[PDB]
Design an enzyme around this catalytic site. Structure first.
Site, mmCIF file in Angstrom:
data_model
loop_
_atom_site.group_PDB
_atom_site.id
_atom_site.type_symbol
_atom_site.label_atom_id
_atom_site.label_comp_id
_atom_site.label_asym_id
_atom_site.label_seq_id
_atom_site.Cartn_x
_atom_site.Cartn_y
_atom_site.Cartn_z
ATOM 1 N N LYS A 20 -38.141 -3.289 -122.863
ATOM 2 C CA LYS A 20 -38.767 -4.452 -123.483
ATOM 3 C C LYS A 20 -40.178 -4.129 -123.955
ATOM 4 C CE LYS A 20 -38.887 -8.809 -124.714
ATOM 5 N NZ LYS A 20 -39.674 -8.367 -125.900
ATOM 6 N N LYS A 47 -45.960 -3.854 -116.470
ATOM 7 C CA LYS A 47 -46.019 -5.304 -116.641
ATOM 8 C C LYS A 47 -44.758 -5.970 -116.102
ATOM 9 C CE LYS A 47 -48.942 -5.294 -120.780
ATOM 10 N NZ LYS A 47 -49.064 -5.774 -122.185
ATOM 11 N N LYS A 69 -42.052 0.037 -126.521
ATOM 12 C CA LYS A 69 -43.028 -0.402 -127.507
ATOM 13 C C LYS A 69 -42.740 0.289 -128.827
ATOM 14 C CE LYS A 69 -46.649 -3.278 -126.945
ATOM 15 N NZ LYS A 69 -46.870 -4.355 -125.939
ATOM 16 N N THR A 123 -49.225 -15.567 -123.994
ATOM 17 C CA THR A 123 -50.204 -14.576 -123.555
ATOM 18 C C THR A 123 -51.474 -15.243 -123.040
ATOM 19 O OG1 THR A 123 -49.339 -12.906 -125.079
ATOM 20 C CG2 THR A 123 -51.578 -12.607 -124.240
ATOM 21 N N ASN A 125 -54.164 -13.949 -131.676
ATOM 22 C CA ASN A 125 -53.277 -14.887 -130.993
ATOM 23 C C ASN A 125 -53.728 -15.139 -129.558
ATOM 24 O OD1 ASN A 125 -50.708 -14.722 -128.939
ATOM 25 N ND2 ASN A 125 -50.424 -16.277 -130.533
ATOM 26 N N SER A 137 -41.170 -14.185 -123.184
ATOM 27 C CA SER A 137 -40.184 -13.447 -123.969
ATOM 28 C C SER A 137 -38.919 -13.202 -123.160
ATOM 29 C CB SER A 137 -40.768 -12.118 -124.452
ATOM 30 O OG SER A 137 -41.571 -12.292 -125.605
#
Lengths: 413, 410, 322, 415
Positions: free
Chosen positions: D69, D93, D105, D189, D220, D347
């Site tokens: 992810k 994470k 990523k 976030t 963001n 997510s």
């Protein structure tokens, strides 16, 4: 008057073919319509940023004998019933040259003459996207038709290859050579017509040396055919395009006409004295070959034809009532499902080379193509003269026999 | 980057001569896909080592990608990228429906056991399986790999697939779908390139004078094959010295008294130097494995009508610049050595059919491929009036560039 | 007299004389995969009947497995296991890229209808589809199965696959991708074996007298074409040249392999071309067994077992199975 | 000089974390580099008819725990080392908030500010076609990152669904709500960072209402966090973007700035009197939140930070040497791998909702998010207190734990 509907005419002859082969009503009910017909709407982003939605068709007549085969055409007058009829002709074509194929066909209601290269590519990719679930190298194998060429095959092949995550050249035929295409593809149809014209001439004791030939239409098939007859010693006395016709009793200069030839195959516009298409069809000759549009020999002129041999290079040049008339008059008619089978035969060879990953040279393809056209002509001609039936009905029997036997073997009937 | 940037310039020079714009070079200067992978392997002692593997797939415009896998301590990302781009040109030279691939694992096979090399071979396939296969990327043997390593990789892929996929990898044993006529495929390929160059210069082969540098397994094979065909070989050489004798030299006797290293000139007192071997009086001259034997310093001294490079850059570009201006027929290594890639392609076609050819049919099909490839490069070098090396580059890259244009990639 | 154990004794001896370890026998003495299945079929009278079916796959080391399916009330699990091993040996003698397989259904097809036979065949394909296919396991005809049963099975696999898969099964009718020359494949196969036996004995065929003992089917064709445990070792003493069943009958496996190759290409050979390749295969196969019988100084029955199992033992060693 | 390489910096903290957990050297050799790294070249037809070829990356660190992810960023400075360290961020994470994911990523070397809408669509589609063989709802799940958004996610989702011939919403997260996205994902976030700030404020006995907070970055994460803090009664005295910074001891008017913000989070160009980002980081305050680029707190400015709590919203904003300095000065540092886990958390909720075809509402998503962030702050804090180590090392031990256990169980490592 007479029936000019292409779809119902084909059904009526197929019903009689199946009847003369001894099949009952169930077999006709299975073959009178394609097993699958997919109507599709393709949104395409145009150059001005606007969105156009196009109607597309992919018909699949019968996959009893194997995967289906048939080209995709882009034309504003594409209709559902025309796509269905053409897919049955592909079944008949493949049956005549004994290919492990069933019939298929596709079409997009659009005008490419009014579109750019970028717009046609996105419409081409959107077409593969919209129908990908029922097509493929083992399912349904398209090819070029009206207003589609090797460049469009290249985009459709790339689009399918992207969705499959590997190269699938067997999905589509007519491809450029660098993408797995086959040598002998551009001249495949004109070669088969040339082979069949030679065989029809033998059966009527006509020598190609000095034979008088008129060809309606100056497209890809018609022009290649005019150059082959000129190289064989025949006199191409009549030639026409969409706009008009020119004629010389001792033989036109085909090399002169082919040099200053339009990208659309138009040459009569450069001449003052033309003679139109209606008169070209009624010219005195040995061999008349329509290679233009449909319904050009239609009962009203069927009695006025002076040729002893008629070879249908295009699709549906003479109506049902005209083949009847031409048959009583003693003319040797060669049906379009047989005469134009060379295109399907070399497309088949391309698909086989894609299967193996191994490609054949010019001489090998031509040798394989000749045996196919030669054996197929003998089978249709023998059936017609032996059973005392016209050549179109005799060709549909040769063409549909394998699909009917396969349908019965597989338990479908 | 040394070899990689050099390879990038080769592509740029060929594309510029063929007439493609900057965007075509920007597409082909780097492989479309590069997979760097880490492989855990249980070692014999019970510990765990992790190896770095690579798979580069340069361009699949022409078809599935093809190229070998090497186990070596000096494998690098730039090396596998450069070498896959050379596979594109190789396949283009012999007109194969292939693109350039290449793989490598950073390891020392001599320090590993047989089970460790197997488990490393299986983990490599497992780690890159998502982007390889008989229709995507077809690996094969290279440095420190062999038919057994190919057999281990074919088995692991067929296990993941739940069915036998012999077309995934080439170089397999004959009982696993390997091809006959594979051993001397590259060497016999050079043979066909020599004879075809002789006919281009209208040289009689029966009385032809041949000079060959190096006498290992590669050069000594060429010496016998030439004398066997009746050609008169007048000069051989090895690592130490060289022997020159006119009107033949009895190669059958030199192979008799040859050392396991290929050293034959320590048994003769008056022996000529290797530099003199390169300027003899011969119709056909074929250099050795080492590079830079023909340079600008001795370029005008070559007294041979035909020169066949049989070993990755024996002549410098300036020596090619001079030899071609003198009217000498030079044959590049990328064209002469394409026999191995050709027969590896045949193994794949046989695996695609499930039907396998006899040895002689393989050799007949290999001849036509080498024959037609030579004529194509010679015709391109002749028509454009360039040296045959640049012409080989253009023939090798042309199909990928044309295919990329057709498919809308540029 | 048990066919399975007798077959196991065949394989154990051939491997030992070829020089393999006993671990190779333990891998080959039993099929790698055996599937036993129960097939519900709706009969004509409206009742349901559940049939037992087997699918044995001996070894896929050399390639996909090959072997017909028989419908017989005496079909047994040990019969199909041993029959698959004989297919491995047959394919190895003609050097086919195949392993051995075999299937069977315990049923009496003579007491079954045309529709019941179709629904039993389809239910058999449905039931074993997960481990068969054009690249895994390729069935064919056998005792009471023929081209129509093959067509029904080809149709069913194609329906599940959503596309035509001719290569799944052999013995199909011509219009469905069948091969020409399959009709007299085994019969022509026995004919080849007899002729090459005459050249080894330096016998002119024209002046050779012929004796035939068949009263069934092939002998009649055989006459027109011309115009045990202790017993095998007896003929070897007298100098006679005996040809085993597993070699002279391989023409059936050879032409069904040709049908599969044509289904792989989508390109089909004419009859004379099939006879050409069929001659060469039985030519070499007899020569290979003849070389093995003389060079190794053994009877021909055991010689054929060594040629047929050799390629499987070698492939298994290469792939790392033993 | 100090190690500013994000990839080798993480490797040493990962090596030290696995050491303290009692793993062998082989486990570090398995986790120090991603298991899979795909480098890709993407051709794109530009608006003028020409063709540009872009470079893409997709790093897949470890899939021992489950599918990998992580998002995709569009920036002209993306490097191979960056997305490798970014994927390693994601592994830790997911372990910290206990998601059934591994790390991954992606990135593309490009400048979206110089590209049109059509060129970004064709690039997004080109990126999916280039890596489609190794990604999917069960393999590798992309998402939003720097200079990407729900629209680019929507284009990438459509491209993957066409290739599969059916809808695959679980392929990628951050989708629009109409395409199977999740409520609360847009602000996930900043909301996770907010929950972490409240937890750090408690343990420092600092009331949020009236606290002085400065935030570097106005994207963001920075935009939403500025409003999240001003709504909670905090004085947002420091704000910054890629060109400057704004300072006001009374607290900046966040709604004013949000009304005048560029598509890319730029607002300070409208002001004559601005400070730089270096002065922004050294402002006197209670809570400093780096939400901009990497390596903003370095050895050269770590001694000059006057906040008592530093919460890393961006990826790797402080260096290893700056981490040691900040810790020794008694500053309560909340590592990026913990503070920025809200995005991957929601997510993950989006992915579960795609798995079921059933969707939750804000309060349900919000309740699940708070439990994760609350439990994860406590675990990382307790680890740092119990073992007497800095918070980043403690966060790596917590986050690397599940991947090492899974690697052992699956037979990937010895013993």
């Amino acid at each position: 008057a007479e029936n000019l509907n292409l779809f119902t005419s084909t059904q009526e002859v197929v019903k009689e073919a199946l009847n003369k082969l001894g099949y009952d009503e169930a077999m006709y009910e299975l073959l009178k319509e394609p097993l699958r017909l997919l109507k599709v709407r393709i949104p395409v982003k145009m150059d001005d940023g606007t969105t156009q939605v196009f109607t597309g068709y992919r018909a699949q007549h019968s996959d009893a004998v194997g995967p289906t085969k048939g080209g995709v055409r882009f034309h504003p007058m594409v209709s559902e019933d025309e796509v269905k009829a053409l897919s049955m002709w592909m079944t008949l074509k493949c049956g005549i040259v004994d290919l492990p194929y069933g019939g298929g066909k596709g079409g997009i209601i659009c005008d490419p003459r009014q579109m750019s290269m970028g717009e046609l590519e996105r419409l081409s990719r959107g077409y593969v996207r919209a129908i990908s679930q029922i097509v493929g190298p083992t399912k349904d194998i398209p090819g070029p038709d009206m207003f589609t060429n090797a460049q469009i095959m290249a985009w459709m092949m790339d689009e399918y290859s992207r969705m499959d995550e590997f190269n699938s050249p067997g999905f589509i035929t007519g491809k450029p050579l660098v993408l797995g295409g086959s040598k002998g593809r551009d001249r495949a149809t004109a070669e088969g017509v040339t082979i069949v014209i030679q065989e029809a001439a033998k059966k009527r004791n006509i020598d190609i040396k000095g034979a008088r030939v008129v060809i309606q239409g100056f497209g890809n098939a018609g022009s290649f055919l005019a150059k082959f007859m000129s190289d064989l010693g025949a006199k191409v006395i009549g030639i026409s395009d969409a706009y008009g016709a020119l004629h010389d009793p001792n033989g036109l200069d085909i090399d002169y006409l082919l040099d200053r030839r339009d990208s659309f195959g138009t040459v009569t516009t450069l001449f003052e004295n033309t003679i139109t298409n209606q008169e070209l069809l009624e010219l005195d000759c040995d061999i008349l070959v329509p290679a233009a549009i449909e319904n050009q020999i239609t009962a009203e002129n069927a009695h006025n034809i002076k040729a002893t041999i008629v070879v249908e290079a295009a699709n549906g040049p003479t109506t049902s009532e005209a083949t009847k008339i031409l048959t009583e008059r003693g003319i040797l008619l060669v049906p379009d499902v047989l005469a134009s089978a060379g295109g399907a035969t070399v497309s088949y060879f391309e698909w086989v080379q894609n299967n193996m990953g191994y490609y054949w040279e010019e001489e090998e393809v031509q040798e394989k193509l000749y045996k196919k056209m030669y054996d197929s002509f003998e089978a249709v001609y023998t059936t017609a003269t032996t059973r005392n039936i016209d050549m179109r009905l005799a060709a549909y029997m040769v063409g549909v026999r394998r699909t009917a036997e396969a349908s019965r073997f597989r338990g479908w009937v």
